[PDB]
Symmetry: C3
Subunit: 558 residues, 3 copies
């Protein structure tokens, strides 16, 4: 009775013999990871010892020696996990973990390169290695994530639920990790002087989905994907959920449709979605629930046969309250079942997190009719790490993904991210006359200084040197500048890239230590980016803007 | 046809597929050990080269580099062997071997820490590592030894013979190794100046058993354990074996009972055991064999159906002679079989060692009646390393386990060892009025000095700071001192601990370089330990006393 | 459906379970090799960096550290691959690759020993390691190559084709690699000053065979080996192929016999072989093909039932032309099939190399009658690396195997090589009166100097200190010298050794920097070796002569 895991479908699972060997591969892999962790423990112990007495030659030699051994072991393990043919997909999650550790360790070596070396500045070679490895690890992960996706997508009578299960697990266990790599570059993101383990916080803006779907389903993966998931969009915050009920027959009252009230980041306007489901004759709006608090867990109750006839949905809010949709069907139907959805750090409570261990909050709901009275209901979730105020930290580089903008003009649109950026991107294009414009509103933190200086950096991709107008508005007053992008990528026929690589993202600093943004305490800042007279084939794709506190160190570095 | 090993019962052995994978795990483990040994060979080669020319910077650098690589490899392998889930028990023996090598190597690094390092005294961190690893390796080994033991103990219709086979093999292949770890501490046991590989000799005082038991047996594991093994006791030396025979019917003369004549270490008194078996009507004492020489091999002859009707037993002595029990049954019964018992270093002659390769000697025999004329017969064995004279070496630290005492008062008793000390312990307690007292007689070696100085150290465990009266008698004259123990452990309700940990054993030196024991050549020394007015809840548990030659080095160190 | 490989016959292949585990072993081995290659990549990258700025202490430290880690990993992997019991033969090819890499890396360390070390001359210990490893790797490879050979040789109803397939694959994948090891010794073959990767070119003179044999065949392995392969001989070059056809019945015209016209290296004489096959009544010589250009691919066409009735053979020459044998049978028989033979670097075109990727050329053909009109036809192949002019390079040590001689007297004979020298050897013995003499003609390259000096070295094995007369003839003038061999080996009854070990081959320099060979440009040089009054039990076995350009470096070194 070999154990089965969600990502073992590319191995031979048709027989007990192969399944047993696969089980061994997993067991050996875990043992190798325990060895990796022991090497890391040895490094940390010697590192801490050295830090307490930096001038001790013996401590210095010991940590350098351990750094070299541990670094070699991490790299070797990543190579092994990505080169055991036939098990690439199976080992992708553990590979991502070791790759993650490998890069974090190298970051440590770069931070202390000067102190450890005698000639100093010997971090150049190690830096090139870090960049090379970052590219390799992301490339391998994206390649295999997509290979597995294609396998499930083209599977005969493929089931969408399995396809989605895969995307969700890969996002949580692999893709989210890849998104952290950019922040590990210590030259791009200097380490906190007091606590080197601190990192510029990376946000994962992508949405993952959970859904109640009939099983088996005869609807295609493509059809269900379009009906149950959202097309690319600016990050939204869930504010209200409307529900319709079929009310013609009281003993057959079930959910019939839903609508969503939502808002963009730091926007005072309420957006309204279209209606999902059936809202015609006999289907009436019966509920309008204001979700004033984040929802960290939901449950849905439906009949078993026929399935998917929904009588209730519960929404658990972080403020401890519960909101619910009830069809008020009477009498109560037979065979009701309740399914929970949510994400927890506790492996023991998979779909039932508590207010203390949830990792995602509800962002959307879509209803898709199967037959009269029966529907598939999907729940979209966003990572709890996303800041609803686009707050600018006083003590670290603040990352604010471009999808958290609250304004896009006609030639600015959200496009699908490549998979390693943590979410989607904003493409600024030109129809020949109008150039794409994005506006993102951020909130400064509370501080005593009359004003503080901050640099403004942009992580982007561009297919040509394009002049950008970048500005920031504070208290009705706008200040701007111009800066040109470099050509970071090229694609045949200049089609919007769906496969941007890590190396195709670069950085530009419209505002810096010389001419920084001068911001006051606890104010709403409007930052805007818009190309200046750009051609119809030129493209500027923004991943995120970054706000950099201008300190003495940043000043000298610049 | 996968190979089966005594300790693979915790793996899935119900099918050929799992058995085949398990066979591979064993094969890969052996290959990893061969790699470990090659790393050790490389270290030794470079070490020897450096030793011949210590000042050669190139040799010094080479051995340090190899030490670091080999040390890393040994640790990594120990971690792997203890973290391959589902194979912990299977790999315990090989894990013990690598753990053993890992600690011996670290000992080497500590011994040469000063010469190899440039700042010197850099052995502190390495020392902490050695202590940490020692605790980890013992903990893992004891945990799994006991898990496997419980599995066999609670097995439906469990067979005692399998249970005992397991304890015996685990003792020889794992537990005995753990007992050596304490002696590897170079701060506690300074390395011999001439030959660093020399170690303070550790004695394994535990008894292992072999037995002729009917198969299958309907008697419980608990019942057979009590009937075939000995309750905790001071170490004894086998001096005489008495045998009874059922003599009513000449054609049915078989072994019916046995008694043992034994002596404590360096005791001139002969102790007599109770009679084991049937000694009533028709059962008569027919043999009294004086075992003047150690027995290294035995054989027992019994009928096959019914089995266990014993007609003969042979005892092979190291002086080349043979002693035998013969029931004198006439005529000779049909279906006689002979079974040999013994322990050899030669894997080819399992139960039949020669006078040149035996590892254990006979210490006891117990008979347990199955039915009239049929008996189970157990043979107890002690390790040949145990010194029958408690001799004090002139050139090394002498270890003398407390169980080798020859006197215990009413409040002093032997208690079961935790499994990593090589045998049992002596607990000195108090009934409120009398405190436990133990006396151990040791023999000094032959030397020319009028008298030599020796320190006296005690490895013990205690649940409170208790004052101890420690003395030594030489030529009728007693000299003593007092020293207090430290609190090394605590247990709920102050119950005698059956699970003392390595860290719960500490050391105290009643006699040292300042005030040592002054002993003359080739004399019997009586050493005694007894708490001074101890409370009824206080406990002092002695593992062993150690005699330390007081040399210039020991003097300066103290 | 586990994959099957030619050298897995020593593993349990009788069932799917074992085959599946074996498949995993292969997959894991490939992953380990990918790790090995990554360690090598890291070394190379750091090496190149250091070379560009040798005085950079940081670069120097980095490459030394990587050298140590990578060297440790290569050795560890070689040990693992040779100590995974039950898989020695299966892993022999990959083991040879890692052993090869291990030695090449150590060579690198020796070359840069002085620059990397601070005390210098620290290469002695590393050199001993290299020699030790070379002996170990060759010993393991030869031992297992022969074990596998014996298994196939003594297989019930053993098939010669399988036996030969094995010898051929082992030669290409293992034996040829072993032959390179001698040249890796940097003390024996100093590295090229400009490009350290350059090596003294080693020639593999052995022949491998391909053949069309009936299947199954009732003829023994020994019988077919004798009938289809050549007895030991001096290296020969294929010049002409003669073919006989059975011509009595026009509708049954098939190949009946063949003869070979060949020449020794740099010999103006044409040698004629005996006739192989049937050449009596009804069998007539119909073809005499002059092979003026090397043949890199052949094909043979025969009927299917009965099989082996040959109607055509095509010979693809490197000059782009095609020569063919045609039986002219009429009408064309039914069931004709065509089989191709050849060796390519392209794994996709196994038996069909192109003029751009072939690795071997045709050296011989033998025909063996099965029944009237049906024959087995074997094709012998020599490695394309063999120089047809025994050219003496101007810029490197030239190796010229003794089998490339073109003259041997009565007491000089070719003997079977041990398997690690790349081919056979020349044994110079004595019948008491005449001592063996070998003559090899080499061509100097084109250069402008009136004359250049070259040392002459001999790689040999000898069972006693024997005086050798060594001479070289240039433009009719002979110059000679005498030098004695050392005793390098001993065998019972002084039987010609069939198992010479690496350590049993040593070197002697008849001509050196002091008294070198003085050769002019583009001339044919005749080099001869012949013992001086040698006893009947003395033996001098020559592997190869080596010509050494006498440069300033060689002069100072000598
Ligand atoms: Br799973
Ligand atoms: Br697949
Ligand atoms: Br160190
Ligand atoms: Br890739
Ligand atoms: Br930078
Ligand atoms: Br930094
Ligand atoms: Br820190
Ligand atoms: Br779901
Ligand atoms: Br779910
Ligand atoms: Br559909
Ligand atoms: Br949508
Ligand atoms: Br949008
Ligand atoms: Br609202
Ligand atoms: Br509500
Ligand atoms: Br749950
Ligand atoms: Br606009
Ligand atoms: Br704040
Ligand atoms: Br304002
Ligand atoms: Br401005
Ligand atoms: Br610019
Ligand atoms: Br600009
Ligand atoms: Br392009
Ligand atoms: Br950049
Ligand atoms: Br300003
Ligand atoms: Br345009
Ligand atoms: Br066994
Ligand atoms: Br179990
Ligand atoms: Br070294
Ligand atoms: Br444990
Ligand atoms: Br100590
Ligand atoms: Br020491
Ligand atoms: Br020593
Ligand atoms: Br037994
Ligand atoms: Br036994
Ligand atoms: Br019982
Ligand atoms: Br007892
Ligand atoms: Br006792
Ligand atoms: Br007696
Ligand atoms: Br006797
Ligand atoms: Br035996
Ligand atoms: Br007393
Ligand atoms: Br003595
Ligand atoms: Br006395
Ligand atoms: Br006293
Ligand atoms: Br004290
Ligand atoms: Br005291
Ligand atoms: Br307690
Ligand atoms: Br202590
Ligand atoms: Br005294
Ligand atoms: Br008391
Ligand atoms: Br194959
Ligand atoms: Br075999
Ligand atoms: Br380095
Ligand atoms: Br060998
Ligand atoms: Br040499
Ligand atoms: Br060289
Ligand atoms: Br080079
Ligand atoms: Br062939
Ligand atoms: Br072939
Ligand atoms: Br035959
Ligand atoms: Br021949
Ligand atoms: Br010949
Ligand atoms: Br010709
Ligand atoms: Br032709
Ligand atoms: Br082909
Ligand atoms: Br001659
Ligand atoms: Br030339
Ligand atoms: Br001439
Ligand atoms: Br001459
Ligand atoms: Br000589
Ligand atoms: Br000579
Ligand atoms: Br010999
Ligand atoms: Br030599
Ligand atoms: Br001359
Ligand atoms: Br002679």
């Amino acid at each position: 009775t070999p154990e089965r895991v969600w990502n073992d479908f590319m191995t031979n699972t048709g027989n007990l013999i192969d399944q047993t060997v696969t089980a061994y591969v997993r067991t050996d892999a875990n043992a190798k990871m325990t060895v990796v962790k022991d090497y890391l423990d040895q490094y940390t112990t010697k590192f801490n010892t050295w830090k307490r007495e930096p001038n001790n030659q013996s401590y210095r030699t010991a940590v350098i020696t351990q750094f070299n051994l541990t670094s070699a072991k991490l790299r070797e393990t990543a190579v092994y996990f990505s080169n055991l043919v036939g098990y690439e997909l199976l080992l992708l999650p553990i590979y991502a973990q070791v790759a993650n550790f490998n890069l974090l360790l190298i970051r440590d070596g770069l931070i202390n390169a000067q102190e450890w070396s005698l000639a100093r500045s010997a971090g150049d070679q190690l830096y090139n290695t870090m960049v090379q490895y970052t590219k390799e690890y992301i490339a391998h992960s994206i390649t295999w994530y997509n290979k597995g996706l294609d396998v499930l997508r083209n599977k005969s009578n493929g089931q969408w639920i399995t396809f989605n299960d895969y995307k969700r697990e890969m996002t949580i266990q692999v893709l989210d990790i890849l998104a952290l790599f950019a922040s590990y570059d210590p030259r791009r993101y200097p380490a906190d002087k007091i606590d080197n383990t601190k990192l510029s916080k990376t946000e994962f803006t992508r949405e993952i989905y959970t859904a109640l779907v009939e099983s088996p389903s005869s609807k295609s993966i493509a059809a269900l994907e379009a009906a149950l998931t959202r097309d690319v969009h600016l990050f939204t915050w869930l504010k209200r959920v409307d529900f319709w009920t079929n009310t013609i027959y009281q003993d057959l009252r079930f959910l019939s449709a839903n609508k969503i009230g939502f808002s963009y980041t730091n926007s005072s306007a309420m957006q309204e979605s279209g209606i999902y489901g059936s809202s015609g004759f006999g289907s009436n709006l019966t509920h309008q629930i204001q979700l004033n608090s984040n929802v960290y867990k939901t449950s849905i109750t439906d009949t078993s046969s026929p399935s998917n006839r929904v009588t209730k949905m519960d929404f658990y809010k972080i403020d401890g309250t519960l909101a619910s949709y009830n069809s008020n069907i009477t009498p109560t139907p037979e065979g009701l079942r309740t399914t929970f959805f949510g994400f927890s750090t506790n492996e023991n409570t998979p779909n039932q997190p508590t207010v203390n261990d949830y990792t995602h909050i509800l962002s959307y709901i879509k209803t898709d009719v199967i037959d009269y009275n029966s529907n598939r209901v999907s729940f979209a979730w966003t990572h709890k790490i996303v800041d609803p105020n686009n707050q600018i930290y006083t003590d670290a580089i603040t990352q604010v993904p471009a999808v958290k903008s609250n304004f896009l003009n006609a030639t600015a649109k959200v496009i699908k991210g490549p998979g390693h950026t943590g979410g989607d991107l904003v493409a600024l294009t030109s129809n020949g006359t109008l150039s794409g414009r994005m506006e993102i509103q951020c909130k400064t933190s509370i501080f005593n200084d009359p004003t503080r200086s901050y640099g403004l950096r942009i992580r982007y991709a561009a297919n040509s040197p394009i002049v950008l107008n970048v500005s920031y508005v504070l208290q009705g007053v706008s200040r701007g500048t111009t800066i040109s992008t470099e050509s970071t990528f090229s694609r045949p026929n200049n089609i919007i890239p769906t496969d941007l690589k890590y190396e195709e993202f670069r950085y530009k600093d419209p505002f810096d230590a010389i001419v920084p943004m001068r911001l006051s305490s606890n104010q709403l800042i409007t930052i805007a980016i818009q190309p200046l007279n750009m051609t119809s084939n030129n493209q500027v794709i923004i991943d995120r803007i970054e706000i950099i506190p201008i300190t003495q160190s940043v000043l000298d570095e610049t």
